[model samples]
Target: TPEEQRAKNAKTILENIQIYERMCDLFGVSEDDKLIIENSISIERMIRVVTDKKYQAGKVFCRLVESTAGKCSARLGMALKPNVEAVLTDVLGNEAVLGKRMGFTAMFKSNLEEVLYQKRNAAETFTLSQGASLEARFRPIMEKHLGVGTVVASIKNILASKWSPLEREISFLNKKLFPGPMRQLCKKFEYLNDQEKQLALNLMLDASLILKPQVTHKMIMPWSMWLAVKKYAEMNKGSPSLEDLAAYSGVRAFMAFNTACYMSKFTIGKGIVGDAEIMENGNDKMQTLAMACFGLAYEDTGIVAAMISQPMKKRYQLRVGNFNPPEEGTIKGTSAGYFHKWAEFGNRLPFNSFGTGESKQISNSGVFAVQRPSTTNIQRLAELMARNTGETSDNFTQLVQKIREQVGTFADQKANLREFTGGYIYDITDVTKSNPKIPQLGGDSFFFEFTGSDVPRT
Candidate 1:
């Protein structure tokens, strides 16, 4: 019975083949055209017949199409077109296809369009169905041909689908396949047109085994960095400090680092493993060095200087008065244990005091002497002059001359010297503990020796 069943099936297949061949002949198909048509029919039939069989049918289909060398034909075309359109037309008719129905139509339109347009082999078809859709009727024959770990199935889906362009497909691939580095590169290349961006992407891909390193992660640093950095510097008024440079450099490095780390976690155990170790090296060693150098040379230096000098300290001290002891019983005394009683007098000034170290009139002149010349003040004066004269003052020379003349005239006033006679009125006071007396301190006398030798010498 089994043998008869197989024989019957073989006879049916052979008869079907003969009928299709005669149709080709009646259509005046050339031998070459006939072969193409027969082969195409054979491929399509193989795919459909295998659907009810084991998964082996998809494999068989893959092998047949891969081996077939010629173009496709009408029989193959009809077989590949899913009978969905005819079924839909029979059920829904033309009038029922709108709104939500239109949505379903749109959803299937790409599939229908693909079957009509592309010459898909069994392998390609099977791949599309198996990976993309689970529906048995719509399954492609090439599903089994996809090698383990290969993204060929995904590639086929993109090629078979008509909704997206090559660039958009590549962008999707970048996000899905290469992610971190690819995203970084793409973000950098966002400003570029599709052609230039693709060119940059190709160069990056070719340079390294990684699918797509970020624009900055690649071995070649784009001139775009310089342009961006220069623009930033110009807008901000000065060059970015080393810390800022470090941050800029580190963004790319971290991207490369994380990309390699992710790839190492996922891809090494799978197919097509690449040079992830080299990527790690670039991220850690090269990036760290760059960041450290930038921070020390630029950012930290200025920051440390500013931190140390922030608390304003007086260079000279001014003397107000000396200490003296009061009469003995004129001051009230409290008992030794009267802690609560002493609380009331805590705010009172002490009546008796110890001897002074030395009475000296220390000049406070240096307190205001070190004032920095304000650029804002200069600009304001310039504005004032411009407003009054209706002519713009471009340079600082006029301002400087005015300041000098004013200072000289003030210094020449006799009243100023008379007012300064309370003590030696110099710009700075160097009051040392050794200089016990007031007027005996020479102009160069030192006031106090700062104790901390570890303080920054500069």
Candidate 2:
């Protein structure tokens, strides 16, 4: 019976691939979908080669692999290393490591297990592919008659009302596919009148499509963002339309989550985002907690507000680990100070590091606020030090005069220059500490709370 089932599934898989190929030619497939179709073809060919009926008889199955690869033990006979020799020794059960031939089954227990496994998994894979095709087939039909927007709305309502007969039926279908759920749903489904049945089936099909958007449209949102959106959708009393969810600020929410992931990676030594540790804390409460902490530490409502105003698609592109600096800038206009914060955090820089000794104190106030210089900036800073030390022709006064002429007066009261408390001075104060890997200064560099005599005068 299993053999019969395997034969039947094999035929279906072949038919499904053919159907998918024709559908691709007719409607055009996405690059992503094209890759899947190509992979399916490769697997089918591999199956054909592995399961030839003539090759299935006797030692020929063993011969097929052994004749080419010369069995696992002997294949590596030419390998000239003690470690490899030891590995061969263990595999061949002693000094037979030099060269030995064994049947495919005798080569490794997994070899037999693997061949046996394909028989079952191939059928399951066919079922999954069949489900995908069915969803694809229903896409145009359902989208034409009832728009996905309305369909999603109706299905959401059904799913929301867990006590409803159809909701229970739908939940069952979600847990497992076909026959069982079909029978369970049909038992109650048949009781409905013609109009009711038609509406219910439409709702079912629509829910199916919503759950699997790949068959219809490439889901533009990241999986994490979609999960976050669904979280909001779940909170509503009644179902929200797909458009309503589309407009939701899942991007802003996920940014906080993404920040939390980065924070954990540095401070807590937890794994990055999408890792089990980070994802475990990916709930709304945790996301808000992270945002609050970030807001508090940096006094960075500007970046927070910027993220809020950011386009959904733009924010979605800011993937964890692979975050590209936004071309349009990160805050207000430029990403000037954006990346430096993370760099500072990574290097474990002082939150507020200023001053040389007592009179020169590392004040948290804007008067003494320090922006950590980037590595390249430090190189220029080192040149300033070089001039001051008389390593070149100029002295400190000459260097200062030159800088003033080029960039204007630092003490001009009318100028906004005094508001900029300049870069961290301590790291470069000593020759021993001047390096690119130096820790950066971080903390409330934006907010200004003037200390006594801390304000600069012209």
Candidate 3:
């Protein structure tokens, strides 16, 4: 199956799931721009919802993640498909479209080291945003302005302020990258000890910043959004006997990324179906589309806002009946047009002819005779009949069996097309013909009006 279900739902599910836009800017990061703007939301929602705590984790966090990770995933999928548009990435540097992100990578490595050596998830880190007393102290550590002595002192301070349990110390062993003949310097001027181990803090900083997969290696300034480490202390207690402090340091550092702030929902808008009869109703759909089509904007504009935005992104509203492939097409019977294409597999029958004003729906998209079937439309006709006549379904089951078997005479008059030489094909380009390429615009649609902030009263 084409999984009409997936195509139907992928749009909203793809909105957020990332904080990974290395593509940064002064207007703030790409995240701040996309979530706050181009999302096409009303201005007020941007100010109230997206800019505050409400935008964190379960809220904007979900959409935020999607716009990043999902976007990368989708782009990768496409790049793999057809071809890798090298013209876009290699030569262009994906600059205009993709852009660049700063890599003062040591910033994060040093900051994390400070927190890690503190072996404390330092709760003080959490309220730093709302904390005025919180200095740009972390910022200096990020900059290389903080001396190693200061680095050692800060780490020591973090070490001393253990709330949950004593955090293990992080030691650095300065490795010699040079090939040597062991010309040990005489003990007077340089005293090399028997158990020779050295840790140059700058070298430690380089290893911390550079040696990791790019995905895990980016410089995310944790001061803005970061995990408070204490929660992971239990699963932790590592570097070893977890004894090896270096190895254990690695485990705790990775675990720290698992805090509440880093949490996000993968499918925040999963069940949100977009239908709205007028607005604010079913399937996660409010009445945006129908209302826009019905002139709610015009109503607000002193009776003159004669416009409708029929963007091609919407599957152009699935058509049946007069606009359907042919007559009898309007009747929702067989695995026929629109909804059934990839969603189902089977035969199709026509239901073109229809009576006017028979409680059928039609718009600028005209109508056709409700050419009947076993009553091919079986449902629509059954619904209309049952609704107005109060008819019972006592024999409805037995009645439909009458439908499953006949393709002659009166049934032909009823317009069932099991034996047509030509009727309709599944997918094609002729606009006159209906196909199954219908978009899931069955509910919510993008709507906007001419009037801006103040609803101009003519």
Candidate 4:
């Protein structure tokens, strides 16, 4: 069904992202109704067009994405005031990340005509095409619409309460196409009226889940990053991880999220003003959590090998995760933040391969935090001299300092990280098949295991 769904969706939105075309596909309007939507573009014009003709509210969403087919010009741009650009600027900001948000928002304010949404796609495409990893993808469209999506209770259609529809069909979208909650924070969605949320869902699906972006942005970075992690860890090369390779993805992701927001000039407004004076967090949370997994994982495998073979040699585990001792105050919303504190209660991490008789819970239903199962199961015994060294409090403190950058930083990029973390973990788990292989001396969980006799090094 998902395969069939993806194919059908990609088909409908293939050629263009024009406002009316987008809405037609979204609402499944008929040929005649499409003309009504087409004619509803200019708010003043839209109001008159629907004055006697009659229509529903869903047909008018120029809130931030209003406009018709036209080239951008100062007159047109300024004319867009109280339109998508301004509304998004007022609510979201001038930040580049919200261009798409503006594109869709203008429709709610003006007629069915303003092409703000289309205009946004163009600008973002231009930015990304100029040799930069531009992040103004469709995923963020839902992101901005979802808002602090971490908790569904806090999630709202946003525009739903702002605008209402009397028509049953349109009303269905209000309840179904757009629902409340995210990150298990709020309530889940309900079945909307009979219309296919499928069609509206197509726009976003068409934009992302494609071959190119998927390969380049989604797949490439994590693969390359982890490949390097194994390369250095295996060769025991100097500066095996130049960028430390621990939380490297997190820092990079944070920079990209900021850069996109900076370019869009969007902000929370109120206090934070202007592109030169804005700030937000929550981008690097996942990256660092992945980093933490790297540490726990390396400790289980990479560190284990060296600790045994070259016991006296000074070594380091450069990875990211629970670098901060997440407290109750900051622990309510995050798996990492909360788990860091939870690790204290466990005999070891919930890793399946930490040691003999050390396995833990699998899934917590809605709470999908810390689910790791080791794949490798071999080990080397620790050397006699190295058996008790590096266990000092100071060394333990130093190990965590490698990820101190994660402390207090907000975890904003939850959705982005979810896919990425999965991809990287997939690569790691399937490493036995990778070209050179990342060396499988340990299992795949956060736990550590020790085995093999005190073997001498080459």
Candidate 5:
């Protein structure tokens, strides 16, 4: 059973990867790159591999770390120093010649903030020429090695990077280079001469956009569901009442929305759905329902009102009796009294019971009533019903009649109703019931029957 469950989980992971691969292809990601990325991460297998390696999984682990760094740098404009160190150590140990160089680079990159802050202070304390020199010395290294995308990726990887004070610095620089309010702030840094200010402005502006807001998984589901529902409604020429639409749509929408919200409480990762561990966890259904309610309420007022009014309806009671004494030996009782006890008994039944004994008793005793207020305004319901009826009529019979009139022969009739109205059958029950002598066609064959006083000439 455990093996079977493991296989199921593996299958689920593979299917998810397939979905991702399809999405990547649709978005123009190269097949080779997609395959490499999918294989390299093998998120599902990683945990197992790590466990087998005594919690090491060296190469795969390093690749994952590098990937994390790459993604974060590409998206966030901040990098994790420790991750860089770990990766470098894994790539080339301290004894190797390249290891020292890599280590130094990692250290320099990690200390980027410290270096920048010191330069700023020096620039403030020293002569303008001295400040320019310090800036010039630091500028080339920072500009040459760091890229917008890499920085963005780093921001994505380090959960702490979200709170990285450096984001504000990057944001400020971004504004300055782009000639916004940030440029004004840069101007306030009087240590910079006009030429230095211009250069700094240019350097900051040339840097790539950093730290893009991740498109959450939760957002994807509801948006997709909305689009799907809208398309279906359009094709059908009207929408189903919210209550009538398939429950799966709501379930899916809620799952996505809730997953996204819950995931937001953590850091972002490449495996959006998997990383969120939605399927692995049991919170899926409750969150899904919550999300569905959220999405539906977001779109339709009536649905929201209906959801809110459910409790009131459950609480309300209908009066069915009065406490009048019985009359004579006939055991006469007030209509209200007899009806109340009958209703109470009905409420006690499994199907009608609200699962709360107190409420059921109160409801049965005529102390409370079931509310029956309509969710939609009468005018809105009328309009919706009329629209639905019109569309149904056109699809069901009116369209067929129009085609029949145009074609003018039974032979011209095509079995095309299925395209418009799902499926239907034309029954000759009225004519066949009247004439018992009429020969019936066997179910194996398709044929039309004609009933008249005389047969037509061939």
Candidate 6:
């Protein structure tokens, strides 16, 4: 009877596969798309690699089409691309309108657009210090009181006439600028139409002078630090010492450092297991948890940064995580906390219980962790394991070091309130918590370090 029941279960799975494959045929899932789906890790991977939110959103819409095959086909027709694009238009505001709003036209109005774009991109490739220098090179040309026309002319001239010195500076500045949403805009500028180009230029021209050139410049420090440092400097009428800064920012710094140290390894015989070592070098689950914990900790830092920022409207609204929850709300296994929780699930298993080293309350704020079973989980896990340990090592430590080091640097400068005058923080708070009775939605939090800037807001 057991053998017969197993045979019946296998037959049912086979039948279901056939039905889904036929449904795919009806909905126009092509050979290439199917091949990718069959071979690839997960939709999240697809969404992550493609930085464009529109494209990322497109994959989700396509998934909708695939799952609700008949309904979508009946209502929207069998044309996959157009319908998917249609859903994208509905879900992510019209790209053209967003482009125009971003002021793509103003930025690319001249031949300098192409030149600056090339430099911006090349600048993006540089190290952080190098990128900062590149920003410095462009500032004088743009900041001069000359007419916009002259501004354009001077930049082209310097770029054309002086190549070597500028290139060296560019190389150095690249190191400082590193990467941020602003640079990412340049990365996407290549794909943008004339209208999109203008919006981007408009934002940069006005916003650039006021905001720190690098996101990390402002984001690296916690809001409490910003607020506290501002008060101490004003009340005492003198700058806070680096020692005070260390005490304030470093208060929570140990949480990260200690957790990183503890989670970085696996202790054996802690629970049910008699004897075993889940060392950092070869343990796949341990490695994945390490990376996931790092990301969660980093996001918690940003969310804290965004919420404590000076102004809500001005805060960086970029979705910090890989997935954007639909308007209805978060998807299971789609939020940043989902992986952390999934890893936690594995941890709860007998020999696997070393703990995630962060609050369980943290996962409560993110989306659902459950998802389509089997292949999706397996492939994602496999890809997680396949990641080069070297790459993970660098990304994890760099941010860890920066968050720890930069706050002290801010204090060392006598806690300059001017640099972070108008900023915003995205607070995750209780809004994202899973299944709250009240279901409150959390959002950007605000505080002003100090308002007026030499460059007025656009």
As for candidate 2, its clashing pairs are none
Off by over 4 Å in 5: 1-16, 19-183, 186-458
What lDDT would candidate 2 get against the real structure?
Answer: 0.26
lDDT at position 399, candidate 1: 30
* Residue 383, model 3, lDDT: 26
TM-score of each: 0.17, 0.16, 0.16, 0.19, 0.16, 0.19
The local lDDT score (0 to 100) that residue 191 gets in candidate 3 is 32
Q: TM-score of model 3 relative to the true fold?
A: 0.16
Q: How many pairs of residues collide in each model?
A: 13, 0, 31, 64, 30, 44
What would the TM-score be for candidate 2 when compared with the true structure?
A: 0.16
- Model 1 superposed RMSD (Cα): 37.8
With candidate 6 superimposed using the best TM-score fit, by how many Å does residue 154's alpha carbon deviate from the native?
19
Off by over 4 Å in 1: 1-85, 91-167, 193-195, 207-458
Candidate 3 lDDT over 26-107, as tens digits, reads 1123332233211212111222223233331221211221144333111110112112223224323433112111112223
Tens digit of per-residue lDDT, candidate 6, span 1-458: 54454354334323323333343444455432222211111222222223234443222332321222211111121323444344334434453332321121121122112111113222322211111211222333322112222232333345546445434333322222213333334444435555554454444333233222432110111111222233344455454332333321112222222222221211111111111221111122222222222222212222323222122221112111111111122111111111111111111111111222222121123357775333332222221332222132233224334323333333444432222212122122322333222112244222112234311221
Residue 22 of model 4, lDDT score: 37
| lDDT for each residue of candidate 4 in 150-253, tens digit (9 for 90 to 100) | 11111222213333222322332222211111101111112232122222222222222210121111101111122223333445554323223222122322
Regions of candidate 4 where Cα sits further than 4 Å from its true position? 1-3, 15-73, 77-458
Candidate 6 segments whose C-alpha is farther than 4 A from its true place:
1-79, 92-458
lDDT of each: 0.26, 0.26, 0.22, 0.23, 0.25, 0.26
RMSD of each: 37.8, 31.0, 33.3, 24.1, 32.9, 27.1
